[PDB]
């Protein structure tokens, strides 16, 4: 008698996040980081856009939060790495950035239980999931 199981607790998450991802790249406000804002995808290191994040999502790679998180900051950094300055459009986006870091962590710091985020990852000791 295991309680509960460590699949329903999954289930929630895969859905949970790609729906929080969603909602931003979705809205035109944040579309700006659906898409590589560089001028040669081939300068970029570590390429990250909330397009590739719902993919993970639906290839069961986040078994946690936190590993969802870490995803969302790494987009604010890099749209800074490379990114044109003294032109008119920029001054926003650098603010954009920022704010995207906070809403999405907002959404997950409040919705994300500290009981359910405690759950997902004591998965990822047995669950098969890699990393």
Known sequence: GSSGSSG?????????????????ATDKRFN??????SDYLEVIKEPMDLSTVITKIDKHNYLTAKDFLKDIDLICSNALE????????????????????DTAHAIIAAELDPEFNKLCEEIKESGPSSG
Do not use: M, Q, W
């Open 8 to 24: 329903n607790t999954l289930r929630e998450l895969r859905l949970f996040l790609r729906d929080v991802t969603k909602r931003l």
């Open 32 to 37: 700006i980081f659906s898409k590589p804002v």
């Open 82 to 101: 490379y990114n044109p300055d003294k032109d008119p459009g920029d001054k926003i986006i650098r603010h954009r950035a920022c704010t995207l870091k």
